[PDB]
Amino acid sequence: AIFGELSSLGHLFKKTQELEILHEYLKEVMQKGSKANQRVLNLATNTEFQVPLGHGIFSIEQSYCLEHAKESEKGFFESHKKYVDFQLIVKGVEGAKAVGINQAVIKNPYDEKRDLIVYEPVSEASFLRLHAGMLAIFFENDAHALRFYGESFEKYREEPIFKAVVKAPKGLIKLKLAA
Amino acid sequence: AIFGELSSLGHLFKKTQELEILHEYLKEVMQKGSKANQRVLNLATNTEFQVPLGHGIFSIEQSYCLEHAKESEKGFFESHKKYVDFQLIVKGVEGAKAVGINQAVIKNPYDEKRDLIVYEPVSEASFLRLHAGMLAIFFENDAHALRFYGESFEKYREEPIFKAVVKAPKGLIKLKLAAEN
Numbered sequence A: 001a002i003f004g005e006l007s008s009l010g011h012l013f014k015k016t017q018e019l020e021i022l023h024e025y026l027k028e029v030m031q032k033g034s035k036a037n038q039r040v041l042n043l044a045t046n047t048e049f050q051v052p053l054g055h056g057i058f059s060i061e062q063s064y065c066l067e068h069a070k071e072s073e074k075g076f077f078e079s080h081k082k083y084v085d086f087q088l089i090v091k092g093v094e095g096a097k098a099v100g101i102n103q104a105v106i107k108n109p110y111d112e113k114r115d116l117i118v119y120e121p122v123s124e125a126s127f128l129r130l131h132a133g134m135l136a137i138f139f140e141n142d143a144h145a146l147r148f149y150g151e152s153f154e155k156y157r158e159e160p161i162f163k164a165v166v167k168a169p170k171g172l173i174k175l176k177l178a179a
Numbered sequence B: 001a002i003f004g005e006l007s008s009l010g011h012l013f014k015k016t017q018e019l020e021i022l023h024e025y026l027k028e029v030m031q032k033g034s035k036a037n038q039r040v041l042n043l044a045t046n047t048e049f050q051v052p053l054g055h056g057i058f059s060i061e062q063s064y065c066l067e068h069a070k071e072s073e074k075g076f077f078e079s080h081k082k083y084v085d086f087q088l089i090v091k092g093v094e095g096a097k098a099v100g101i102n103q104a105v106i107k108n109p110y111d112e113k114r115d116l117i118v119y120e121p122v123s124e125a126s127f128l129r130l131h132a133g134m135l136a137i138f139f140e141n142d143a144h145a146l147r148f149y150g151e152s153f154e155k156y157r158e159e160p161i162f163k164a165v166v167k168a169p170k171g172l173i174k175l176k177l178a179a180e181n
């Protein structure tokens, strides 16, 4: 898994044509007052909206309240095969747990239509505190569970967060420490 | 920051001889009975040992007990400029906190001699639970603090962990998501 500020991770998206619209989209969604930003912040709670980005890439814009205490056995632990997740928090704070799929127990085997494997919870997993402007990238080996709150951002149990989950085909996204 | 199982992250170390050399060391240290593995596991507690790997790359092999409760304001929060950290846990479990340098308050400005910026603690930062075989990679934008314990691995307060922090010159490391088009 990768995580960090979108504004520090721009170099990840340069010099590739397929990624160009995507990077533009991530920046637009974060820009206060932009069309994409206004659209995302106008989402009714517990709804989503899909935006096509070309080359098999699309964004799932969503808003919801946090559900699970970080110190609990709750949460929906999942991983994917076709797609890499680019999770961008637009407003609010979200807790994410992440663990390697080889450390997790499969509950529901891969469902191709939903591009989804479901795991038993791993409560003690790494915990990412994703505030607005932070990007978390989850690959095939990253089991992840979202919608956690911690004591410092408990208000988002009743005040919705806003985010985009960009799905990009893994065939396009090949993480390397070299170009 | 990047984190994951070393055995799931092999694809990262492709297409340069220098990354290949780095990867070879990381794998050797995890292999029970290897020269590097024995060297790391024989360290006395609270000591470290430096191993040059070529190309300006070197490993700081270390052993120590965990010091700070995760729910505390303790911890030495730092970032670097010249080097990228490859932190590999060889035995035990370690908690690491990581936060973007833009959310941290500078305490000690950059010291070029030691390649170090020191920050005020960010106790609520993301928390990485690094068990044996896990790798955390910290780049210049990643402020990080080590030696945390959580309740699920509190035994390493009294029993030492073993790890390597491999320092790679920034010029060797270019994080990319796709081929350049």
Ligand SMILES: [Zn+2]
Binding pocket: A078, A079, A080, A085, A138, A144
């Ligand atoms: Zn996902």
Ligand SMILES: [Zn+2]
Binding pocket: B078, B079, B080, B085, B138, B144
């Ligand atoms: Zn460091």
